[PDB]
Coordinates of C-alpha atoms in Angstrom, one line a residue:
Chain A
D1 CA 17.6 21.7 88.5
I2 CA 14.5 19.6 86.9
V3 CA 16.6 16.9 84.1
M4 CA 14.4 16.7 81.0
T5 CA 15.2 13.0 79.6
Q6 CA 15.0 11.9 76.3
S7 CA 16.3 8.7 76.4
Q8 CA 16.5 8.1 72.1
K9 CA 18.4 10.3 70.8
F10 CA 17.7 9.1 67.1
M11 CA 14.2 7.1 66.4
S12 CA 13.9 5.3 62.8
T13 CA 10.1 6.3 61.1
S14 CA 9.0 5.9 57.2
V15 CA 6.9 8.7 55.2
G16 CA 3.5 8.0 56.6
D17 CA 4.1 6.6 59.0
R18 CA 3.3 7.9 63.6
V19 CA 6.2 8.5 66.0
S20 CA 6.3 9.4 69.3
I21 CA 9.2 11.1 71.7
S22 CA 9.0 10.7 74.9
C23 CA 10.5 13.3 77.4
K24 CA 10.8 12.8 81.4
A25 CA 10.7 15.2 83.9
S26 CA 12.6 14.6 86.8
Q27 CA 10.0 16.8 88.8
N28 CA 6.1 17.3 88.2
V29 CA 5.9 20.1 86.7
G30 CA 1.9 20.1 85.8
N31 CA 2.2 20.9 81.8
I32 CA 4.7 23.8 81.7
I33 CA 6.7 22.1 78.9
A34 CA 7.8 23.2 75.8
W35 CA 8.1 21.3 72.1
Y36 CA 11.0 22.6 69.7
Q37 CA 12.4 21.6 66.4
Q38 CA 15.4 22.4 64.7
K39 CA 17.1 21.2 61.3
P40 CA 20.8 21.5 60.5
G41 CA 22.3 24.8 60.9
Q42 CA 18.5 26.2 61.8
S43 CA 17.6 27.7 64.8
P44 CA 14.9 26.3 67.1
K45 CA 11.4 26.4 66.2
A46 CA 8.1 26.3 68.5
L47 CA 5.9 23.6 68.1
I48 CA 4.7 22.7 71.5
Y49 CA 3.2 24.4 75.1
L50 CA 2.1 24.1 77.8
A51 CA 2.3 20.4 76.7
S52 CA -0.2 20.0 74.0
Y53 CA -1.2 23.3 72.3
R54 CA 0.6 24.1 69.0
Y55 CA 1.7 27.2 67.9
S56 CA -0.5 29.1 64.8
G57 CA 1.0 27.6 61.7
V58 CA 1.8 24.1 62.7
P59 CA 0.9 21.1 61.2
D60 CA -2.0 19.0 63.2
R61 CA 0.0 16.2 62.8
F62 CA 2.2 17.0 65.4
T63 CA -0.2 16.3 69.1
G64 CA 1.4 17.0 72.4
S65 CA 0.3 14.6 75.4
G66 CA 1.3 14.1 78.9
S67 CA 0.8 16.0 82.4
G68 CA 3.4 15.9 85.3
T69 CA 6.1 14.1 84.2
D70 CA 5.7 12.5 81.6
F71 CA 5.3 13.9 78.4
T72 CA 5.1 12.6 74.4
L73 CA 5.7 14.4 70.8
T74 CA 3.3 12.5 68.6
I75 CA 3.8 12.4 64.9
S76 CA 1.2 11.1 62.9
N77 CA 1.8 11.0 59.0
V78 CA 5.3 11.3 58.6
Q79 CA 6.1 13.7 56.3
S80 CA 9.9 14.5 55.2
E81 CA 10.2 18.2 55.9
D82 CA 9.4 16.6 60.2
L83 CA 13.1 15.1 59.6
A84 CA 14.4 16.5 62.0
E85 CA 15.8 17.2 66.2
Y86 CA 13.2 17.6 68.3
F87 CA 13.9 18.9 72.2
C88 CA 11.4 19.5 75.0
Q89 CA 11.7 21.8 77.4
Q90 CA 10.2 23.1 81.1
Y91 CA 9.9 26.4 81.5
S92 CA 8.0 25.7 85.2
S93 CA 11.0 26.9 87.2
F94 CA 14.9 28.6 87.0
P95 CA 17.2 26.9 85.9
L96 CA 15.5 26.5 82.7
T97 CA 16.5 23.0 81.2
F98 CA 15.9 21.2 77.6
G99 CA 16.0 17.3 77.2
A100 CA 19.4 16.1 75.1
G101 CA 16.8 15.9 71.5
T102 CA 15.7 13.3 69.5
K103 CA 16.8 12.9 66.0
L104 CA 14.2 11.5 63.6
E105 CA 16.1 10.0 60.0
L106 CA 14.2 8.0 57.3
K107 CA 14.4 4.0 57.3
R108 CA 16.0 1.8 54.8
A109 CA 17.0 -1.2 54.1
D110 CA 21.1 -2.2 55.2
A111 CA 23.4 -1.2 53.3
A112 CA 27.2 -2.6 53.8
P113 CA 29.9 0.1 53.6
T114 CA 32.2 0.9 50.7
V115 CA 35.9 0.8 52.4
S116 CA 38.6 2.5 50.6
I117 CA 42.3 3.2 52.8
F118 CA 44.6 6.0 51.5
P119 CA 48.5 6.3 52.0
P120 CA 50.0 9.6 52.9
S121 CA 51.7 12.1 50.2
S122 CA 54.1 12.7 49.0
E123 CA 53.5 15.5 49.4
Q124 CA 52.8 16.0 53.1
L125 CA 55.9 13.4 53.9
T126 CA 58.2 16.5 52.3
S127 CA 56.7 18.4 55.1
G128 CA 57.4 15.5 57.9
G129 CA 54.0 14.1 58.1
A130 CA 51.8 11.0 57.5
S131 CA 47.8 11.1 57.3
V132 CA 46.1 7.5 56.5
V133 CA 42.9 8.3 55.8
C134 CA 39.7 5.3 55.4
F135 CA 36.2 5.7 53.4
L136 CA 33.5 4.1 54.7
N137 CA 30.4 4.8 52.6
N138 CA 27.1 4.7 51.8
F139 CA 25.9 1.9 54.7
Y140 CA 22.9 1.9 56.8
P141 CA 22.0 2.0 60.0
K142 CA 24.9 4.9 61.2
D143 CA 25.9 2.5 63.8
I144 CA 29.7 1.4 63.0
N145 CA 32.8 1.0 64.0
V146 CA 36.1 2.0 62.9
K147 CA 39.5 0.2 63.4
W148 CA 43.4 1.1 63.5
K149 CA 46.1 -1.1 63.7
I150 CA 49.7 -0.9 62.6
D151 CA 51.5 -3.9 62.3
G152 CA 48.7 -5.9 64.1
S153 CA 48.5 -3.5 67.3
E154 CA 45.9 -1.2 67.6
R155 CA 46.4 2.4 67.7
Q156 CA 43.5 4.7 69.4
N157 CA 45.5 7.9 69.3
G158 CA 45.8 10.5 66.5
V159 CA 42.8 9.5 65.0
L160 CA 39.9 11.9 64.3
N161 CA 36.8 10.9 62.3
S162 CA 34.2 12.7 60.4
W163 CA 30.2 11.7 59.8
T164 CA 27.7 13.3 57.2
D165 CA 24.4 13.4 57.7
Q166 CA 21.5 10.7 56.5
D167 CA 21.8 11.5 52.5
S168 CA 18.6 13.0 51.1
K169 CA 19.4 10.9 47.9
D170 CA 19.6 7.3 49.5
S171 CA 19.0 8.0 53.1
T172 CA 22.4 6.7 53.5
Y173 CA 25.4 7.7 56.0
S174 CA 29.7 7.4 55.3
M175 CA 32.4 8.4 57.5
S176 CA 35.6 9.2 57.4
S177 CA 38.4 8.5 59.3
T178 CA 41.9 10.0 59.6
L179 CA 45.6 8.5 61.6
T180 CA 48.0 10.9 61.8
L181 CA 51.8 10.5 62.8
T182 CA 55.0 12.0 62.4
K183 CA 57.0 10.7 59.0
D184 CA 59.5 9.4 61.1
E185 CA 56.5 7.2 63.3
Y186 CA 55.3 6.0 60.0
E187 CA 58.3 5.2 58.2
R188 CA 58.7 2.4 61.1
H189 CA 56.0 0.5 60.6
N190 CA 54.8 -1.4 58.1
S191 CA 51.4 -2.9 58.1
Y192 CA 48.2 -0.5 58.2
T193 CA 44.9 -1.4 58.1
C194 CA 41.5 0.5 58.7
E195 CA 39.3 -2.0 60.1
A196 CA 35.6 -1.6 60.2
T197 CA 32.5 -3.8 62.5
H198 CA 28.8 -3.3 61.0
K199 CA 25.2 -5.1 61.1
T200 CA 25.6 -5.7 57.3
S201 CA 28.6 -8.4 58.2
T202 CA 29.4 -10.6 61.0
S203 CA 32.8 -10.0 60.7
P204 CA 35.0 -7.2 60.2
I205 CA 35.7 -5.3 56.7
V206 CA 39.3 -5.3 56.8
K207 CA 41.4 -2.9 54.0
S208 CA 45.2 -2.7 54.3
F209 CA 48.7 -2.4 52.8
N210 CA 52.1 -2.6 53.5
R211 CA 54.7 0.7 52.7
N212 CA 56.4 0.5 49.9
Chain B
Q1 CA 5.7 39.9 62.9
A2 CA 8.4 39.5 66.3
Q3 CA 12.2 39.4 64.7
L4 CA 15.2 39.3 66.2
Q5 CA 18.2 40.0 65.1
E6 CA 21.4 38.9 66.2
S7 CA 24.9 40.0 65.6
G8 CA 27.4 38.4 63.4
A9 CA 30.4 35.1 63.7
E10 CA 33.2 35.9 66.3
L11 CA 36.3 34.8 66.4
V12 CA 38.8 35.2 69.5
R13 CA 41.7 34.1 71.1
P14 CA 41.2 32.3 74.7
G15 CA 40.9 34.8 77.8
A16 CA 39.1 37.7 75.6
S17 CA 35.9 39.0 75.7
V18 CA 32.9 39.5 72.8
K19 CA 29.6 41.1 73.1
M20 CA 26.9 39.7 71.1
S21 CA 23.8 41.6 70.4
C22 CA 20.1 40.7 69.8
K23 CA 17.9 43.6 68.2
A24 CA 14.3 43.6 68.7
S25 CA 11.3 44.6 66.7
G26 CA 7.7 44.3 66.2
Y27 CA 6.5 44.2 69.1
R28 CA 6.7 46.2 72.3
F29 CA 10.9 45.1 73.8
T30 CA 10.1 46.0 77.2
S31 CA 6.9 43.1 77.6
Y32 CA 8.6 40.6 77.7
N33 CA 12.3 38.8 78.7
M34 CA 14.5 37.9 77.0
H35 CA 16.4 34.6 77.6
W36 CA 19.6 33.0 75.9
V37 CA 20.8 30.0 75.2
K38 CA 23.4 28.2 74.1
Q39 CA 23.8 25.3 71.7
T40 CA 26.9 22.7 71.7
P41 CA 27.1 19.0 70.6
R42 CA 28.3 17.8 73.5
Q43 CA 26.1 19.4 76.0
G44 CA 23.5 20.2 73.4
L45 CA 20.7 23.2 74.4
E46 CA 21.8 25.1 77.5
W47 CA 19.7 27.7 79.4
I48 CA 22.2 30.7 80.0
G49 CA 19.6 33.6 82.0
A50 CA 17.4 36.0 81.2
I51 CA 16.7 39.8 81.3
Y52 CA 13.2 42.1 81.9
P53 CA 14.2 44.7 79.5
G54 CA 11.3 46.5 81.3
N55 CA 13.8 46.9 84.2
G56 CA 16.8 45.8 83.7
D57 CA 16.5 42.9 86.2
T58 CA 18.2 38.9 85.5
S59 CA 18.5 35.7 86.4
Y60 CA 21.2 33.3 85.3
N61 CA 21.3 29.6 85.5
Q62 CA 24.4 28.9 87.7
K63 CA 27.1 27.0 85.6
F64 CA 27.1 30.7 83.4
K65 CA 26.9 33.2 86.2
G66 CA 30.0 34.8 86.2
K67 CA 30.7 34.1 82.7
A68 CA 27.7 35.7 81.1
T69 CA 26.8 38.7 81.5
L70 CA 23.0 39.9 80.4
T71 CA 22.0 43.7 79.3
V72 CA 19.5 45.6 77.2
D73 CA 19.1 49.6 75.6
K74 CA 15.5 50.2 76.0
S75 CA 16.0 53.0 73.6
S76 CA 17.2 51.0 70.8
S77 CA 15.1 48.1 71.6
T78 CA 18.4 45.8 71.6
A79 CA 19.7 43.4 74.3
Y80 CA 23.1 42.0 75.1
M81 CA 25.2 39.8 76.0
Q82 CA 29.3 39.6 77.1
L83 CA 31.3 36.6 77.9
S84 CA 34.3 36.5 79.6
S85 CA 37.6 34.9 79.8
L86 CA 36.7 32.6 76.9
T87 CA 37.8 29.7 76.4
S88 CA 37.9 27.3 73.8
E89 CA 34.8 25.3 75.7
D90 CA 33.0 28.5 75.5
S91 CA 32.6 27.7 71.1
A92 CA 29.4 27.0 70.3
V93 CA 26.0 28.9 68.9
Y94 CA 24.3 31.5 70.9
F95 CA 21.1 31.9 70.8
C96 CA 18.4 34.7 72.2
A97 CA 14.9 33.9 72.3
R98 CA 11.3 35.8 73.2
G99 CA 9.8 34.1 76.7
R100 CA 6.5 34.0 76.9
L101 CA 4.7 33.2 80.7
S102 CA 2.7 30.4 79.6
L103 CA 3.9 29.9 75.4
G104 CA 7.2 29.4 76.5
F105 CA 10.2 30.4 73.4
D106 CA 7.7 31.6 70.6
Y107 CA 10.5 33.5 68.7
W108 CA 14.0 32.8 68.4
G109 CA 17.1 35.1 67.3
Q110 CA 19.2 33.1 64.0
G111 CA 22.0 33.0 66.8
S112 CA 25.6 34.0 66.7
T113 CA 28.8 31.4 65.9
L114 CA 31.3 32.4 68.9
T115 CA 35.0 30.8 67.9
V116 CA 37.7 31.0 70.1
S117 CA 41.0 30.2 69.1
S118 CA 44.6 30.9 69.3
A119 CA 45.0 30.6 65.8
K120 CA 45.8 33.2 63.6
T121 CA 44.5 32.9 59.6
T122 CA 45.9 29.8 57.9
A123 CA 45.8 28.5 54.4
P124 CA 45.4 24.5 54.1
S125 CA 47.7 22.2 52.6
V126 CA 45.8 19.4 50.2
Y127 CA 46.8 16.7 50.2
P128 CA 46.3 14.4 47.3
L129 CA 44.3 11.2 48.0
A130 CA 44.9 8.4 45.7
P131 CA 44.4 4.7 45.6
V132 CA 46.6 2.1 46.8
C133 CA 49.3 1.1 44.4
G134 CA 46.4 2.5 41.8
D135 CA 44.4 -0.5 42.4
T136 CA 40.4 -0.7 42.2
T137 CA 38.2 -3.7 42.7
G138 CA 35.0 -2.9 42.0
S139 CA 34.0 -1.7 38.2
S140 CA 34.6 1.8 40.2
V141 CA 37.0 3.1 42.3
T142 CA 38.0 6.0 44.8
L143 CA 40.1 8.8 45.4
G144 CA 39.6 11.5 47.7
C145 CA 41.7 14.9 48.9
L146 CA 42.8 16.1 52.2
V147 CA 42.6 20.0 53.3
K148 CA 44.1 19.9 56.4
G149 CA 46.1 23.1 58.3
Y150 CA 43.7 25.8 57.9
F151 CA 41.8 28.6 60.0
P152 CA 39.4 29.7 59.8
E153 CA 36.6 28.2 58.5
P154 CA 34.7 27.4 55.8
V155 CA 36.9 26.1 53.0
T156 CA 35.1 25.1 49.3
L157 CA 36.0 21.9 47.5
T158 CA 34.6 20.7 44.1
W159 CA 36.4 17.9 41.6
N160 CA 37.1 19.2 38.5
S161 CA 35.5 22.4 39.0
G162 CA 31.7 20.8 39.8
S163 CA 31.9 18.5 36.7
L164 CA 31.9 15.5 39.1
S165 CA 28.5 16.2 41.6
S166 CA 28.0 12.6 42.0
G167 CA 29.5 10.6 43.9
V168 CA 30.9 12.2 46.0
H169 CA 31.2 13.5 49.9
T170 CA 32.4 16.0 52.0
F171 CA 32.6 15.5 55.4
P172 CA 32.3 18.0 57.8
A173 CA 35.6 20.3 59.4
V174 CA 36.9 18.8 62.5
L175 CA 38.8 21.4 64.6
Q176 CA 42.0 20.0 66.1
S177 CA 45.3 22.1 67.8
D178 CA 43.6 25.0 66.8
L179 CA 42.8 24.1 63.3
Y180 CA 40.5 22.7 60.7
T181 CA 41.2 19.5 58.5
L182 CA 38.0 18.3 56.7
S183 CA 38.0 15.6 54.3
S184 CA 36.7 15.0 50.8
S185 CA 36.2 11.6 48.5
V186 CA 34.9 11.2 44.8
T187 CA 33.5 7.5 43.1
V188 CA 34.3 6.9 39.2
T189 CA 34.0 4.7 36.6
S190 CA 37.8 2.6 36.3
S191 CA 37.6 4.1 32.5
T192 CA 38.0 7.3 34.2
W193 CA 40.7 7.5 36.3
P194 CA 43.7 7.1 35.1
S195 CA 42.5 7.0 31.8
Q196 CA 41.5 11.3 33.1
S197 CA 42.4 13.2 35.2
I198 CA 40.8 13.9 38.3
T199 CA 41.2 17.0 40.2
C200 CA 40.4 18.2 43.6
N201 CA 39.6 22.0 43.3
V202 CA 39.8 23.6 47.3
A203 CA 39.4 27.4 47.6
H204 CA 39.5 29.3 51.1
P205 CA 38.3 32.7 50.8
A206 CA 39.8 33.8 55.0
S207 CA 43.0 34.1 53.3
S208 CA 42.1 34.1 49.9
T209 CA 43.9 31.0 48.4
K210 CA 42.8 28.3 45.6
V211 CA 44.1 25.4 45.2
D212 CA 44.1 22.9 42.2
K213 CA 45.6 19.6 43.2
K214 CA 45.8 16.6 40.3
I215 CA 45.6 12.7 42.0
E216 CA 48.1 10.7 40.0
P217 CA 48.6 7.0 40.0
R218 CA 51.9 6.0 41.8

């Protein structure tokens, strides 16, 4: 199989800048590669075919280049609508293969996360459950690490995380982390902590509490 | 003028078998190959196979051989893809697309979402999230709502019936052990809560449920 490689999962840029997304084929496929753009909850949209041709109706700021194995998609004078995910594809020989895609995100100034932790509710405890929740809102870059520590020990089992897309209003990122235990287990420990490491701080941000 | 009309979402339990459709219009159906692609956050876009509606010939990606079967109905310009022995691994979005020998996939359907779960419709449990001991350091405070144990999607969530639209973050739902759990936080001024009541309104149409959970100080 011909492997298509897009080394950068994410790329940061600004409106008016020029970006170049790379894509490499494990074998020489001449100019039989295409580029597709895709936005949240939508289907792929054809932008480039035959390595450098633009489909009818595509902005001229979009340009494709390369031949053989090294290809690239360049977007000069970037626009807000251009912010999306880009996939390259070789349709030279079966099985047809796509790259892993590259997400284009708006660049913005660094922002530390606002962290807040919450204990299990009475309602959930009555049902025999216990979830501890941690919110880490409006931070940037998107890279961040969250850890849970029960009475000093890190706990990785029973944790579920959810991340939001880059906010269209302030270009920041938010995350939610929930640790779920059984009521019995919850009432078996005392110290619960949410620890986050982020570019904006040398030391981790710590939010915790003790049962009762 | 070309248009690919895919069938709607599907919900089935493991071992089952679904048959998605892709109605074509605006061009000569038998002149182009119809391709199918699978999309998933973990595997990305994956080519499944292609069918030439002209004679019915097909090509399959080894990886989906035995999993997917492609056919067409020439008279109704419709293409089909059936997936059997479904498992949670087959849960993804499936697109049909027109294949052009030299221009690649010039057209794509909207896609059909396939969710494979052994779960049955289930209303969510709405849990209030109040700050530890009702405290807050800044001139603002953050409350939240934990919507867990529901199926299927989607869920509608608002704060104070929508009056509080600013400063809210409703996180994407996560599927775990057959059920979904979503999260939502809201940030307001210290002078707002507990002073004034903050309520989490959660609706789940699939089960016809509406729940209003007020965040109480403890």
